Amino acid sequence: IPEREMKDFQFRALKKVRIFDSPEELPKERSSLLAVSNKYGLVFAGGASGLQIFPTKNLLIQNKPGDDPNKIVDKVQGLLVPMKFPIHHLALSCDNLTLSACMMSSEYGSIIAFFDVRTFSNEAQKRPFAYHKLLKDAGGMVIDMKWNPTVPSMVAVCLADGSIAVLQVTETVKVCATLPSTVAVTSVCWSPKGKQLAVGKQNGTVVQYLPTLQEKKVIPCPPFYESDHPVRVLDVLWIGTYVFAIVYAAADGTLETSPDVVMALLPKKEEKHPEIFVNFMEPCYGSCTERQHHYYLSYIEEWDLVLAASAASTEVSILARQSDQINWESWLLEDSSRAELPVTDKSDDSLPMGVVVDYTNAPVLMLLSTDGVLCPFYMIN
Amino acid sequence: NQVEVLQRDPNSPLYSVKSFEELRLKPQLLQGVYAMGFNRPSKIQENALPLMLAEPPQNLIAQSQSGTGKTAAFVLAMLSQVEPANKYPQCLCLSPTYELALQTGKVIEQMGKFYPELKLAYAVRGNKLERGQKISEQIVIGTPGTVLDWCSKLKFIDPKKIKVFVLDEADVMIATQGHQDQSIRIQRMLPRNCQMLLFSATFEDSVWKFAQKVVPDPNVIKLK
């Protein structure tokens, strides 16, 4: 609930780098098109223009005094791995050895290419090693996909139709457990240790499952949401065992309503105690209503804060936890020290399609704009 | 040397001014100018003032080294259009720094002293409020991030009610992080007939390209 002026945190901007030509039209679908290997020091960015793999070094350039901060660096050396269809989702395994690319294709449907990251290490084929075909409809659109934080071979995939599958990849893709579209899953997140899986549902609950998909716990749809105004879970981040960031948005799927970011703290001795739900409302100010709602959440443990970014907003805001470690504040930063996405040549807002944090160089936040520009920032706490 | 008129649109008055009296200001306002020790207009003010006070109003891009001259010029423009009767921002001024903002603020306060009901808000780092409350002040000054915040994130300011918009030291402005895009996003918010006024000591390609995005149909003037 509470804002507080932080004069001790800067997002210090680095040179923007163009990675793709500007689209003819604003992308509207839920996407996650940016990935970082902090192990091998790589950035992976995808789109309709194929898949690009950069050495993270090449993308992190600081502007010197005299440098027009608004200048966009022309292009940077990387590998181009041509893709038949537009990628909407990229994600790594936890051991950084497997990259998954979700493509949507009018003839085949939606399908996941799995790559052995080590292949990108060679000169001139660079084929994936498995393909998985999720769907033949716009229903097969992948809305959420995360790999297990402690189990390299395992990943949860979440479709537009509201169905989920847990997969194991080794020599091939093995489908371990699915749940049908009637379940209406809208989002997924692994527990910190990867022992359970959290799924956000169309009915605004979050259900904790074991990877086998045996139901362990249900997190109620907060009591302050009137039936009159139903919410679905949009995005969820399982931060600590009993601590969640659950984003809620209009159930009907309306875009006009801006979704709320909520820190949920769960009881241990449940019967009887209630859960604390602390609303942040819109921490990333919504300026667009064209794009599908999506909140990119990231937890920084070291600083005990979340970085939030919204599909509908040009700003990255911070939700930090107070020293009591029960409450959170939003921070307000000096105008010269914010991470906000640039305005396009056409005078338009550019919005995020991917967010990631590199440690291999300060930590660095990186955003990929709807304009195909990459915006990196040092973080100084 | 004189001012250089580099682009002058029609319906924009063609006369230089040699006295603040021939500007036909309100008495309260003229006394204000006089009280600061401005007994006659400066070189820049000779042309900038007629352009800015013309009816109906005209947007201006103005090259001049910053100084009391140019500032008082745009401060007067702002005060001219204010209606202390209506208790809400009507004039918005963007400074590149907190320090410049306070400094220009003084100038407003000084020049508006004989305005009894007129009050000035600072959209800067430090000043806080709750989200419920619209502010009462009729002129607002600050740095673009916080001004942007105010206008659209915190609902402090209804941008659709601002009739004069100053963008000061635009060179210094877009040299600092995020300010360029903040300014653009604020101006976007303002109504069609709001008066756009930009000032910069220097005009390099970037700055000039910027200025044109921000200020439609401008008068362009440069001193010396």
Side-chain angles (χ1 to χ4, degrees), chain A residues 306-318:
Chain A
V306 170
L307 296 185
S310 178
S313 168
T314 47
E315 65 170 17
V316 182
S317 65
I318 295 170

Side-chain angles (χ1 to χ4, degrees), chain B residues 26 57 74-75 77-94 108 115 117-121 134-141 147 150-151 156-166 186 190-191 193-197:
Chain B
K26 293 179 179 179
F74 77 67
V75 172
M78 277 183 285
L79 291 164
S80 310
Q81 195 86 309
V82 184
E83 180 68 22
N86 309 317
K87 300 181 60 180
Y88 53 76
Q90 303 162 73
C91 282
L92 202 37
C93 183
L94 304 187
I108 300 175
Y115 269 134
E117 293 177 350
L118 168 146
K119 303 220 151 194
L120 164 77
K134 278 265 207 270
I135 54 160
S136 309
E137 287 80 326
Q138 316 91 332
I139 300 173
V140 187
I141 187 185
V147 177
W150 283 30
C151 291
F156 287 166
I157 300 194
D158 184 1
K160 291 162 167 198
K161 275 179 194 67
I162 298 292
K163 46 235 256 213
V164 174
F165 175 79
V166 194
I186 294 168
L190 312 161
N193 61 25
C194 171
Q195 170 170 34
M196 260 65 82
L197 312 158

Side-chain angles (χ1 to χ4, degrees), chain B:
Chain B
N1 209 15
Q2 275 72 73
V3 155
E4 270 194 58
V5 164
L6 287 146
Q7 286 179 68
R8 161 172 281 173
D9 73 322
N11 300 359
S12 295
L14 264 80
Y15 303 159
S16 312
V17 300
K18 284 297 203 302
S19 72
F20 295 109
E21 310 86 73
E22 73 208 278
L23 299 169
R24 185 223 278 144
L25 309 167
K26 293 179 179 179
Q28 307 64 23
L29 195 56
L30 179 55
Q31 246 312 292
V33 180
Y34 282 163
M36 302 179 72
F38 295 72
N39 78 48
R40 57 206 183 90
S42 53
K43 295 196 177 202
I44 183 60
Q45 288 181 357
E46 297 188 353
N47 318 70
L49 293 169
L51 298 168
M52 301 181 332
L53 302 180
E55 310 290 29
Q58 298 297 62
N59 302 346
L60 162 79
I61 306 165
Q63 165 144 47
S64 68
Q65 292 178 331
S66 61
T68 316
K70 173 217 79 195
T71 298
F74 77 67
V75 172
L76 168 54
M78 277 183 285
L79 291 164
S80 310
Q81 195 86 309
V82 184
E83 180 68 22
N86 309 317
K87 300 181 60 180
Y88 53 76
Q90 303 162 73
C91 282
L92 202 37
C93 183
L94 304 187
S95 296
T97 82
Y98 170 87
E99 293 177 350
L100 275 303
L102 299 200
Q103 160 171 135
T104 291
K106 282 193 190 192
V107 181
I108 300 175
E109 275 157 359
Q110 274 272 104
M111 230 204 76
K113 77 202 282 292
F114 309 101
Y115 269 134
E117 293 177 350
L118 168 146
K119 303 220 151 194
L120 164 77
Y122 298 90
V124 282
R125 278 279 299 200
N127 266 77
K128 60 178 171 180
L129 295 174
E130 298 167 345
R131 282 165 164 153
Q133 293 177 335
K134 278 265 207 270
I135 54 160
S136 309
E137 287 80 326
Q138 316 91 332
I139 300 173
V140 187
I141 187 185
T143 35
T146 308
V147 177
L148 181 49
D149 279 352
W150 283 30
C151 291
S152 60
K153 191 194 210 193
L154 303 170
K155 302 294 155 216
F156 287 166
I157 300 194
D158 184 1
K160 291 162 167 198
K161 275 179 194 67
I162 298 292
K163 46 235 256 213
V164 174
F165 175 79
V166 194
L167 202 149
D168 194 20
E169 296 218 38
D171 42 35
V172 182
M173 184 83 97
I174 80 177
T176 76
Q177 197 190 298
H179 285 208
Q180 199 224 12
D181 292 308
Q182 296 164 340
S183 306
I184 291 164
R185 281 196 257 256
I186 294 168
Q187 184 289 336
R188 184 198 291 142
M189 275 174 180
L190 312 161
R192 293 182 183 174
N193 61 25
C194 171
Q195 170 170 34
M196 260 65 82
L197 312 158
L198 186 144
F199 302 88
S200 193
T202 71
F203 272 99
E204 307 198 41
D205 289 345
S206 35
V207 176
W208 170 249
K209 293 179 179 179
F210 167 54
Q212 276 156 305
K213 183 178 179 180
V214 184
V215 188
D217 300 311
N219 283 292
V220 180
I221 68 174
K222 164 174 66 172
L223 295 174
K224 89 178 187 199

